[PDB]
Design a protein around this ligand. Structure first.
Ligand SMILES: Nc1ncnc2c1ncn2[C@@H]1O[C@H](COP(=O)(O)OP(=O)(O)OP(O)(O)=S)[C@@H](O)[C@H]1O
Ligand SMILES: Nc1ncnc2c1ncn2[C@@H]1O[C@H](COP(=O)(O)OP(=O)(O)OP(O)(O)=S)[C@@H](O)[C@H]1O
Ligand SMILES: Nc1ncnc2c1ncn2[C@@H]1O[C@H](COP(=O)(O)OP(=O)(O)OP(O)(O)=S)[C@@H](O)[C@H]1O
Lengths: 525, 525, 525
């Protein structure tokens, strides 16, 4: 249809208004003293949250240009949430600060490209500075501490995650379930994990989590693109007879198959999920064979000559539980015999031994690692079901934070790590005046998180930020107790990975938005 | 015309809007880094001043309610300006802070009368605390220093005023005139000073100063009322023949009389000024006799039998120069023979000896003091007339500040005196929660001057105020150099009298405005 | 009346709009290729002018805020025109450039006071750099060259001015009149000159010139203020009987006195103009005695005992021509006997010999210099009266330019002197980022004159400016012939004084306007 275009400073001010609205709405809820925010609900009373993810999710503006600006910031913030699992509102606050200052400078008659270059130089120097400031978190004591502080200062969950990490490994697979008894339960069973996402969001049976849970499902092993709906009618009839859910791996699934599966899921006669095949090519087939060994299934491939129509329930694999993430998959206790698993592990081990290519050897090594280590199961334990759900959520977010800290490290939280990095990089200079201005914009924008936290606490942000900058090391402000002190000693810690990802993505979106003129959008109607 | 009434919270918000407009307008120009403000000139280019008095002079609003709120704040600020000769902007800033906080608290359902009581208690404690902090300025060194810093750091004027104060005395009289040569000149001649103001503003021959300078004027002495214009027609004919200015001292001037004098001055045929007689009763007659001795005139009184109609030029007194301040007068070098002057001084001295009442004795003592000390005169010396004017203005404001410091004392400037007083009174408590809230409002409003100065400098006012409060003694912020340090060492000083008067008057207007409801005003037409 | 106040960024943008309108209107006419600007005339055909002073004299905006911003820029530009006799639109262009860039930077959150400090540092460095670049113009050849260039490339006027300034002196006084003969003639006669201006603009009888010519007038020498009209009644009757315009030289003129004189001049019965007395004190009295010797008049002083009423026509002084410039006076061929003039010169010479004070000795030197050198008189010669007027104007403006060049020097014109100065100061830095940016704004604003000239020529301004910057010395762009080359070789030159004054005044107004917030003005009615 007809499209209204807007280029020049008016496009920038529209984008600024949109990001200002979104950033205010989501930054009000930053820190431990985060002020509540109320989201309208269609039916019933409104929900009340301090989680910035929900606030961002429920933001879109009436004006088209402001809405697109807000949507850009929202998308990059959600990307940051996906990368590290936390620091969404920190990313949005950093983005708002950098964009506000950068667009102000651009309106001040400066070159957008040089500003973006200066900001990029500043942020990469800041990233390597964070890596310098990073403190390793390999010891189980710090693992327990970070798990504790992530889960609202609960030592039991920190202990549980520490034991699970020791049991499986540093880079192992950890999952959380519900336990019958009041006592917490831990057990390690042969499982699976590969990074692939669901084909359509509609497969999510629990939207509040964004995943699926399929108790004792059949898993279908396919190496051929899903072309026609006629290929999986016999298996659909079989699973309808079984009255037990189903999951599908495939090289790809075409749009008509997506529509058919969505229709079947809303119908509810069969609950089926589908996910992209892992790996690529010959190794995709190798790990499909690994999954066949796990679940007792069989790979169905056109090259072999097998067809999906002639598939029996025995040919299908099974597990006792499967969970799909937005961009990951996990299978727990494939029914396949463990002796066959050991044989396959040995076979891939000799494949590693004969391997000469370094990267192929890396794929084989990670394959044997994921095929031997398996998965961990941490069944939460308490009395009532409401506390089952809340403690399960606490375990989930603590696990995310702890693994993020393990991957890269852990730095002084409360926004003090960025303050220290900015103070360290005070002497950085670019190739001209505009790059210098961009670098200074980045440096003064990295102080946004601490200032916003202090403002939420109600104290004067300028005074607290100046005092924190005056100090050195990890000396910082405690929002909870409103007392200064070494942040590590008082246990306020966040992963290096989350802060790095939030900073990098905020810088990326700010650079992208600074150098934008044209705004093509639908005519308001 | 009809009159509409607005009472309740709407009256308060209208008042707050008006005082906010006036306070912004005048406070932008506070301190050494005061931002310029440009004003209206109907004919010609606009004028620019950093002098807050000029800004407040030109502020009146469209809406009647806001206009009268601004007029009240302007009136009390000008009263402060008249009391101590400085601190108008400080007074307005304090008034705005106290009024804003007090009305915000009154909107919170607190009792206005208790808030006023708390503010009054806080300001009385503050005034006695200032008197505690006050440093004497008796030595001529501090006199020179304060004169120097008052006159844009000019040591010559400080030296001049130091010598003048040494010569004429601590509480003597000092005047400033234009000198002939480039060298500064000083002389002392028998004179006069009594506290009375002009009857109408229209007599001001130089509106930019507010005084009435008269070169070689004839002073006429009258003791009774000015009833009819027929009484001084021969006087007007004689002075017109003389072609020289005239001044009239009388018990009082009627409305018709001052109307005709204004008309004649507008005509320009006779340059006549009117001022009320000094003293009271038989003491008034005694000082009129003193003035007769000073100027060689003769007191005209109906009780004696003499009349104003039978006035001859010989009976008229004369002086070399007379200046009529808004609320003071000064006669310099009375033509009257000095022999009679010391005769009268001796006579009033023997009157002092026989005096029994302490009040009459004090009046006689001050009479002999003014009759013997006379008036010192300081003539400014330079090459050009523009520097004549500017240096004369510098000497005027410098001697105003110096006498203000001499009367009471001198405290650390830059708004740090009020900061220290507020920090000292942090433990002051009232009789009930509302009084305590009022006291805290006053104390937190005492930090307005320093905060505004820092904001004008462009720095973060919160950080600087916190740093200054953290320090003790006279540690403070230097606006000019933007460096901390002992204010007295860097010479930033202001009289205790000006700060005390500004604080007291701001508190008075704020209390009187907090407890107001009914805004009776004319309809907008 | 009620005055509305506007403060913050809205005040600045309104001022920017006003100065933009004025600057466009007046800068369109800059340079030899200045595009015509046709004003409006109430009666008759419109006037068409490329003269910046003429066009800028009329722009006043309908909106109050824009109007006063334009009035400020117009006032400072007219001050620049008064200082050096030229450089109006150059000053306005510089002011517009600095204002635009400075307010653009202030909108970028930067500290206005630091910006003003940086601009002031840049402009003072630029001024001393101009003084470094200055070339002396003492040789008569360059004097004739600059006179020729100023007067639309006329060699005769250059020859005349060079001859006259050789005859009288380098720092003499030169006047232009009309001559009967077609041949140009020059003669020097005893005269007088002192820097004082008319009391009322209404005294101007030829508004297009700004002064009043008096043919064979009487001059009334007075020492006191003219208190009453009755003092000047007998002399007014005498001069009315004489049927000749009168001059009044006196210590001061009152408001009533000048109102009466304006009324009398509008009546036309007496053509009287009044001017404030020169010098000060005893120096004033001495130079009035000199004037008495020059004109054969007599000093009237109350201290001596003489009065203005008892003034006879014999007591009056005489001359044969008098011109009252806006801030200068000049009388030609005082009737006073030359022997008395020589005696007075000798007397002041012995006063010089006995003088010990340096400044009084300088005053006596300048007194004898003006009393002995006299005045140069150059009467223009041609056929018709239209060319009388145009060549007289050419001689006047060429004389202004030549004397301005003589006072200070002469640098390469075409706006290239400012370009070279800016290129020389590229490494100048302030005390922080804000001052650096202010300095850069000042430097990049000094390329505005050349860019505007080139844009008026129709070429690409950036290309020509870059080419000129690439060159060194006086290499530049010739607007008239379109070709590059050494400026001094082509002869087009600008006095150092005019460029320095325009730059300084533009910087002063820009600093004064950058630090402005509040805009109090009459409510639009
Ligand atoms: N007691 C504390 N004092 C100061 N800062 C704290 C404290 N506890 C946590 N923080 C910091 O507050 C920030 C929390 O960021 P938020 O994004 O508001 O919450 P979150 O835990 O990151 O979950 P998200 O990102 O909103 S989904 C992190 O930078 C923490 O390091
Ligand atoms: N160098 C300085 N640093 C800090 N404060 C200063 C400095 N010089 C003066 N002050 C303070 O600033 C105030 C003087 O500025 P203003 O009060 O705005 O003007 P003023 O000279 O007092 O006359 P006004 O405008 O009629 S009040 C006083 O409170 C001084 O103590
Ligand atoms: N032939 C020329 N080529 C280039 N620049 C020239 C030339 N003649 C004069 N100029 C410049 O033009 C400016 C003078 O402005 P003009 O408006 O053209 O004339 P003007 O009225 O004498 O000067 P103004 O109005 O005070 S700026 C100066 O900067 C001169 O150096």
């Amino acid at each position: 249809a007809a499209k209204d275009v807007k280029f020049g400073n008016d496009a920038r001010v529209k984008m600024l208004r949109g990001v200002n609205v979104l950033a205010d709405a989501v930054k009000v809820t930053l820190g431990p003293k985060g002020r509540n925010v109320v989201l309208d609900k269609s039916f019933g009373a409104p929900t009340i949250t301090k989680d910035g993810v929900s606030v961002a999710r429920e933001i879109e503006l009436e004006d088209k240009f402001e809405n697109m600006g807000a949507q850009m910031v929202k998308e990059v913030a959600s990307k940051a949430n996906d990368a590290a699992g936390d620091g969404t509102t920190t990313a949005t606050v950093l983005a708002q600060a950098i964009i506000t200052e950068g667009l102000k400078a651009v309106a001040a008659g400066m070159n957008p490209m040089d500003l973006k270059r200066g900001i990029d130089k500043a942020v990469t120097a800041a990233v390597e500075e964070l890596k310098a400031l990073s403190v390793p978190c390999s010891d189980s004591k710090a693992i327990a501490q970070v798990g504790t502080i992530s889960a609202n200062s609960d030592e039991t969950v920190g202990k549980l995650i520490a034991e699970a990490m020791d049991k499986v490994g540093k880079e192992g697979v950890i999952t959380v379930e519900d336990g019958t008894g009041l006592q917490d339960e831990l057990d390690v069973v042969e499982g699976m994990q590969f990074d692939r996402g669901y084909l359509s969001p509609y497969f999510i049976n629990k939207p509040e989590t964004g995943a699926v849970e399929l108790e004792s499902p059949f898993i279908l092993l396919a190496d051929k693109k899903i072309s026609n709906i006629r290929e999986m009618l016999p298996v659909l009839e079989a699973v309808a007879k079984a009255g037990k859910p189903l999951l599908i791996i495939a090289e790809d699934v075409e749009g008509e198959a997506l529509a058919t599966l969505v229709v079947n899921t809303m119908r509810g006669i069969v609950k089926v999920a589908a996910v992209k095949a892992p790996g690529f090519g010959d190794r995709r087939k190798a790990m499909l064979q690994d999954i066949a060994t796990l679940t007792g299934g069989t790979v169905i491939s056109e090259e072999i000559g097998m067809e999906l129509e002639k598939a029996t329930l025995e040919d299908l694999g099974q597990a006792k539980r499967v969970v799909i993430n937005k961009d990951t998959t996990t299978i727990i206790d494939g029914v396949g015999e463990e002796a066959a698993i050991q044989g396959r592990v040995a076979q891939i081990r000799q494949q590693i031994e004969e391997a000469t290519s370094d990267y192929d050897r890396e794929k084989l090594q990670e394959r044997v690692a994921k095929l031997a280590g398996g998965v961990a199961v941490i069944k939460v334990g308490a009395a009532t079901e409401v506390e089952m759900k809340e403690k399960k959520a606490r375990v989930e977010d603590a696990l995310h934070a702890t693994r993020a800290a393990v991957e890269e490290g852990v730095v002084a939280g409360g926004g003090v790590a960025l303050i220290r990095v900015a103070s360290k990089l005070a002497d950085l200079r670019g190739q001209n005046e505009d790059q210098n201005v961009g670098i200074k914009v980045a440096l003064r924008a990295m102080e946004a998180p601490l200032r916003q936290i202090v403002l939420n606490c109600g104290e004067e942000p300028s005074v607290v930020a100046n005092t924190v900058k005056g100090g050195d090391g990890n000396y910082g402000y405690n929002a909870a107790t409103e007392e200064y002190g070494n942040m590590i000693d008082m246990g306020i810690l966040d992963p290096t990975k989350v802060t790095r990802s939030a900073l990098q993505y905020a810088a990326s979106v700010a650079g992208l938005m600074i150098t934008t003129e044209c705004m093509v959008t639908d005519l308001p109607k």
